[PDB]
Amino acid sequence: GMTEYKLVVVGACGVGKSALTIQLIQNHFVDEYDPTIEDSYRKQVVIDGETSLLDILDTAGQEEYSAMRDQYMRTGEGFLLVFAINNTKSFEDIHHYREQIKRVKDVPMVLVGNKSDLPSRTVDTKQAQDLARSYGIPFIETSAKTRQGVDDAFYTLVREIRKHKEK
Ligand SMILES: *CCC(=O)N1CCN(c2nc(=O)n(-c3c(C)ccnc3C(C)C)c3nc(-c4c(O)cccc4F)c(F)cc23)[C@@H](C)C1
Ligand SMILES: Nc1nc2c(ncn2[C@@H]2O[C@H](COP(=O)(O)OP(=O)(O)O)[C@@H](O)[C@H]2O)c(=O)[nH]1
Ligand SMILES: [Mg+2]
Question: In the beta sheet, which residues pair with residue 9?
Fold first, then answer.
């Protein structure tokens, strides 16, 4: 059989939410994707031998309340919290994104450090590890450019959802 998963990708503008999503959906790096496009995208994959259909909301709007988005997130099963390792402000926003999610919703999440290909690092892996530990969630390093960690990020989130469902 198969299992469907309703996922949401959040994080500051320009961290690579769309690039990550498109790597999952289409398996290549789309470097120019309209920063204002918010949509859900579906992709069939296989995770630990089970056919898995992922529906992924790639967030992009700036408003505090956006009806369709909020109804999606209210019923979202897991969230990727994405920052960029070269942008300290994106990492500082993570705890605010976590707060907003809890507000709309124990919720499966994965902390994602994207742009790991860039040498101009400003956020240390160890800081990201501290934060993920404080929430009791996984931390995964990614590059949407090279595709490093992309499956790890989404598949780890699915694995976190499986665990949550057992409870
Ligand atoms: C290039 C544009 C882009 O990618 N954006 C990403 C989404 N986005 C955004 N901005 C933002 O300030 N908030 C927000 C709001 C509206 C209120 C309080 N805090 C925040 C941030 C700092 C956490 C966004 N909030 C959400 C969000 C809401 O509103 C509710 C539940 C879960 C959420 F993640 C959101 F989806 C996007 C937010 C801007 C930067 C554009
Ligand atoms: N070098 C590098 N650039 C990236 C990566 N992910 C996204 N980008 C670039 O960062 C910018 C913002 O990406 P985008 O997916 O639009 O971010 P979003 O606003 O979170 O959707 C774009 O110019 C992308 O080409 C990455 O992993 N590495
Ligand atoms: Mg985008």
Answer: 58, 80
- Contact 23/144 with Cβ under 8 angstroms? yes
Largest CA distance in the chain: 44
Resolution in angstroms, to 1 decimal, for this deposition?
1.6
Angle of the 125-135 helix axis to the 88-104 helix axis, nearest 10 = 10
The technique is: X-ray
Domains of the chain: 1-167 (3.40.50.300)
Amino acid at 141: E
Backbone angles phi, psi at 28, to 5 degrees: -155, 170
Tokens 């503008």 -> residue: 13
Q: Report the amino acid identity of residue 8.
A: V
Ion ligand 3: residues, CB < 5 A: 18, 60
Q: Please give the number of the atom of ligand 2 that sits closest to the Cα of 29.
A: 25
- Amino acid identity for residue 49 in this structure: G
**Nearest CA, atom 28, ligand 2:** 115
Binding site membership of 141 for ligand 2 (Cβ less than 6 Å): no
